Every structure is written in structure tokens, then in C-alpha cells.
């Protein structure tokens, strides 16, 4: 709305109450909208005796389709916006505006790849709360989107040339952060729950789990026209909202199709004590707050 002249404000995307708020909002949205046939959550508050909470309910098939959300100022507060096109999300911003609301954010729940979000306006950007810490997630923001087309028939397609150009841009940014003489290597997820080992997302109300090995298997600064990822629709899933499991009914549509734009990634670096002149990066995610951070990094709420 209105640019603040000569004002310098500190931002910290990793400690932003707007993220926590959006997170609780999306959890509520899912509870009301997407009801599982069976829902299981742990409860081991007792002494050496666990009590799994089990909910069984009607579970209608519903075509899920994220709708943009705009966050406006909560009572007694104002929203500030960093106008710096290459802002890393953590530090002083010399070009600050006050806005009535954020842009429209689509609350896509996914791992590994960020879909249908905002692109960087200039060059590719990478963000982390601590790059030196191999355990902290690296959020990647693309400046050019890449199409991914998925079908309930069991696969997702991605143009190989476009993806290859994307990896090169990312690796160049990773070199610039970790070392100009380092080889940048992408590898598949090293393990964990199926939801984070695969690129997982929801399409047509169904839960997809796509093998992303072919997307993350290259060496930088040391095929076919289209990359086809094998996928699987699951009925029994681990919940992202909290620790638990949910069961959904099988699909009722023989034509489940969606195309999304990859606009970002979630990565982690292997690290470890290695005198080797290379860094290894694998797809990550799982904490959906990182998904919300990828959109909200440029906003903060301040009390009037």
C-alpha cells in the first residue's frame, strides 16, 4: 500500500507469528474439509500405558482444491512488507512498505517440491536459518516455474530440459553459499517416512506419493524428452498436522489429473566431517511451516 521513506526494519522469517497463525488455519481447514474414514493419534501421557485415540467417521470423497488466502492485519497490529526483490528473509530491510493484506497465498500441502507459489523476481534465492547446520532445511525459490503433470494412473511428468536448467541454477546458488570450488551433488532422500521420502501432495482429493530419485541424481561443476516419475496413491497416510495416521477411501474417479507449477524446493545438505570438496543435497520437507515460510518470508506483523 504505502512505502515508508528512510525506514529500516529487521525481519526474521524463521521467527514469524504469521507462519504459526497460517499453520493453525490450514490444520483447521483440513479437519473441516477432508475427513478420514479412520483417524489414529497416540496418547502416552500415562505411566507405561499407551492409549491410541481412534476416531471412525463418515468419509465422503471430496475434490480438494486450494483457494488463495489473504492475511490482513490482526486487531491492534500492522503488516510490514520488505520490498527488496532479493531479500534473504533474515536481517535489515531498507525498503519497507505497510500493506493492508498479504498477497493471495494458496495453502498447498506438499513435501520436497513447493507448488503453485510465488517466484523470485530476479535470480534464484536460497534461504536457511543456519546454512552451516546440516540439519536445517534449505528453502529454494525459483525464478522460473517448472510444470509437473500428475495422473491417478500412477505417474508425474516433468520436462527434462527445463528441470536440468533448474538444477544448474540451484547448484550455482549453492556454490555461491558453500564454496566456489565445491562440486554440487543431488541425491535421493536418505530415508524416513514415505511422505518425506517421496514428493507427496494431494490431487483431486487423493494422496500421491511420487518417487523423486530421477529429479535428484546429478553432479554439478565437477536422456529422454520427459522425466516420468512413478507414483502411488495411498489410502493409509501419516498425518502432517500432528503425530498420527489416517485412512481414506479408495478413489472413485478413473480420471485424476492435475498440473502444478514447481516454484520452489525444500532441501537438506548432507554435511558431516568431510575434507571432500563436494556438497550433497537431498529433497526434504515435512514441516508445513516451511511451506508457509516460503510465501510469508517478506512480511511481518508489528503492534501499532
Amino acid at each position, epitope marked *: 500500500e504505502v512505502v515508508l521513506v528512510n525506514v529500516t526494519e529487521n525481519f526474521n522469517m524463521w521467527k514469524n507469528d504469521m507462519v504459526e497463525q497460517m499453520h493453525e488455519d490450514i490444520i483447521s481447514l483440513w479437519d473441516q474439509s477432508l475427513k478420514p*474414514c*479412520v483417524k*489414529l493419534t497416540p496418547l502416552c501421557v500415562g505411566a507405561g500405558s499407551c492409549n*491410541t485415540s*481412534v476416531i*471412525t*467417521q*463418515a*468419509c465422503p470423497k471430496v475434490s480438494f482444491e486450494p483457494i488463495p488466502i489473504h492475511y490482513c492485519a490482526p486487531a491492534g497490529f500492522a503488516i510490514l512488507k520488505c520490498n527488496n526483490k532479493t531479500f534473504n528473509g533474515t536481517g535489515p530491510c531498507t525498503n519497507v512498505s505497510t500493506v493492508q493484506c498479504t498477497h493471495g497465498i494458496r495453502p498447498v500441502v506438499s513435501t520436497q517440491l513447493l507448488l503453485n507459489g510465488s517466484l523470485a523476481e530476479e535470480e534464484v534465492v536460497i534461504r536457511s536459518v543456519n546454512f552451516t547446520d546440516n540439519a536445517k532445511t534449505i528453502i529454494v525459490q525459483l525464478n522460473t516455474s517448472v510444470e509437473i503433470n500428475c495422473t491417478g494412473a500412477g505417474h508425474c511428468n516433468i520436462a527434462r530440459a527445463k528441470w536440468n536448467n533448474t538444477l544448474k541454477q540451484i547448484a550455482s546458488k549453492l556454490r555461491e553459499q558453500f564454496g566456489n570450488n565445491k562440486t554440487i551433488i543431488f541425491k535421493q532422500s536418505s530415508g524416513g517416512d*514415505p511422505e518425506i521420502v517421496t514428493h507427496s501432495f494431494n490431487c483431486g482429493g487423493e494422496f500421491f*506419493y511420487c518417487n523423486s530419485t530421477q529429479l535428484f541424481n546429478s553432479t554439478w561443476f565437477n536422456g529422454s524428452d520427459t522425466i516420468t516419475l512413478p507414483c*502411488r496413491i*495411498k*489410502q*493409509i*497416510i501419516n498425518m502432517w498436522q500432528k503425530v498420527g*495416521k489416517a*485412512m481414506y*477411501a*479408495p478413489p472413485i474417479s478413473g480420471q485424476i489429473r492435475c498440473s502444478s507449477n514447481i516454484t520452489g524446493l525444500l532441501l537438506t545438505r548432507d554435511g558431516g566431517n568431510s575434507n571432500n570438496e563436494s556438497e550433497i543435497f537431498r529433497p526434504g520437507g515435512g514441516d508445513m511451516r516451511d511451506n508457509w515460510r516460503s510465501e510469508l518470508y517478506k512480511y511481518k506483523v508489528v503492534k501499532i
Partner: antibody
Framework: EVQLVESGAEVKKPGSSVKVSCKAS????????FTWVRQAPGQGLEWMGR????????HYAPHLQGRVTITADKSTSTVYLELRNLRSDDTAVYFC?????????????????????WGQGTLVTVSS | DIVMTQSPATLSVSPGERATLSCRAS??????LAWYQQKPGQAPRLLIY???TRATGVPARFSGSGSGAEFTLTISSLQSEDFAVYYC???????????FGQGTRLEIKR
């Protein structure tokens, strides 16, 4: 496919409880759901309940809710039915039955309600 | 409570001829409908599920049809081993409260 072998006939006084078992052999236990069905002499089949083995979650017929328990021991591939506060009219043959649900260990689950595999039955007589 | 009703209670058919068994639901159960065969002293045997799909080991002379609240089991040519009691089963609801018809006894007409 799976072979279901049930425990032997039971004789009970009204008010007692009974626990019948069913050993499943021949296939991956957790890829099946199991159901108990009973049949009073001269009468038809009656659905009692069904356990989703992979989740350890059972659901019961309303007229039995509260006095029936279905469990599964994944370590012995054995399914159990417990019926409490037995009545003379609980006299029946009790069948264990099951159906393949898909690759459950990989999150695939058809939630099939029909019954492909059947045990030989267990006579439970409840009488004074 | 979905109530399943079968008719007739007894069907008398001459060997080698066609038999038609009816199953009715008190409300729609879509195609979540199964047919079983039971001989005296034995466990039931699954014949049809999903209203019209034959289970493994079931001869082609058995065929199921219907959807919604009315269903049919047809046996195109009765063999000696086809004379038995037949039950339909509804498994459409959730939470599950599955129910059976009271059976149709198929006997030999002489």
C-alpha cells in the same frame, strides 16, 4: 491366499464369557482384514464385527456393541473373538472370515467388506 | 439399519435348468453387494462381490447383476453341486454395519 483354522467347540453357562481363536496361515497377515460371522442353528448368517488388522482397529454390529471384542496377534497371525455376558441365544456356530485388502504395508487399502476366506467354524453352546 | 430381504424363501428347480434368486435392500447399497453359497455343515463360500464380479474358482454359470437396492443371482444351468442355501450381503455403510439377507434355499424339484 490364507487358510483359517479355528479353535475347538465351547460349552458355556449363560453369563460366562468365551474367547475363540482363528489362526491365519499362508499369506501376509497384515494385508488382510478379518471378520466374525455367526449362525444360530436353523438360522442365517449374522455379521458381528471386523478388524482392520494393520491398524488394530475393530468395528462391531450395534446389537453387540459393548460386549464383543475382536483382536489380532500379529506375532502369531491369530485373530480373536471375545463375547461377554453370554446368553442362551448366543448359541451358534462362529465363523472367522477374511479378505485381502491390498499392499497394506505400503498404505494401499481397499477396505473390502466381502469375505473370501472362511474358517471351519466353532460351535459355541450356551446353556444351563 | 440396512435390511436385506431375499426371495423366494425356497426355490425348487429341476436339474439342468435356470435359477434366479432375488436380493432387495431397504435403501441403496450401490454395488457393495456379495453372494454366498452354503451347504449343510460347511462354511459359506463367496460367489460374487461388487454385485457382478465372480470370485476365483467360481464357474461362469454363476452371474450377478443389479445395483442400488435390487440384485439378482442367476445360475444358468443347475448342477448337482449347486443345490444349497444362498445369502446376499450388503457392505456399503461406514461406519460398517454390514448385514445379510435371510437366505434362499435352492432345492431339487422332482
Amino acid at each position: 491366499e490364507v487358510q483359517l483354522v479355528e479353535s475347538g467347540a465351547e460349552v458355556k453357562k449363560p453369563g460366562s464369557s468365551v474367547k475363540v481363536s482363528c489362526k491365519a496361515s499362508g499369506d501376509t497377515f497384515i494385508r488382510y482384514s478379518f471378520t466374525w460371522v455367526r449362525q444360530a442353528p436353523g438360522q442365517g448368517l449374522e455379521w458381528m464385527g471386523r478388524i482392520i488388522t494393520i491398524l488394530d482397529v475393530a468395528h462391531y454390529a450395534p446389537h453387540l456393541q459393548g460386549r464383543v471384542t475382536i483382536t489380532a496377534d500379529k506375532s502369531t497371525s491369530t485373530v480373536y473373538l471375545e463375547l461377554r455376558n453370554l446368553r442362551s441365544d448366543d448359541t451358534a456356530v462362529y465363523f472367522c472370515a477374511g479378505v485381502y485388502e491390498g499392499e497394506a504395508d505400503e498404505g494401499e487399502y481397499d477396505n473390502n467388506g466381502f469375505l473370501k476366506h472362511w474358517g471351519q467354524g466353532t460351535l459355541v453352546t450356551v446353556s444351563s | 439399519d440396512i435390511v436385506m430381504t431375499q426371495s423366494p424363501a425356497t426355490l425348487s428347480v429341476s436339474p439342468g435348468e435356470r435359477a434366479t434368486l432375488s436380493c432387495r435392500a431397504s435403501e441403496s447399497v450401490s454395488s457393495d453387494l456379495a453372494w454366498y453359497q452354503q451347504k449343510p455343515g460347511q462354511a459359506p463360500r463367496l460367489l460374487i462381490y461388487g454385485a457382478s464380479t465372480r470370485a476365483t474358482g467360481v464357474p461362469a454359470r454363476f452371474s450377478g447383476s443389479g445395483s442400488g437396492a435390487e440384485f439378482t443371482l442367476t445360475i444358468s444351468s443347475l448342477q448337482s453341486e449347486d443345490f444349497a442355501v444362498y445369502y446376499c450381503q450388503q457392505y456399503n455403510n461406514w461406519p460398517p454395519r454390514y448385514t445379510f439377507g435371510q437366505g434362499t434355499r435352492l432345492e431339487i424339484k422332482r
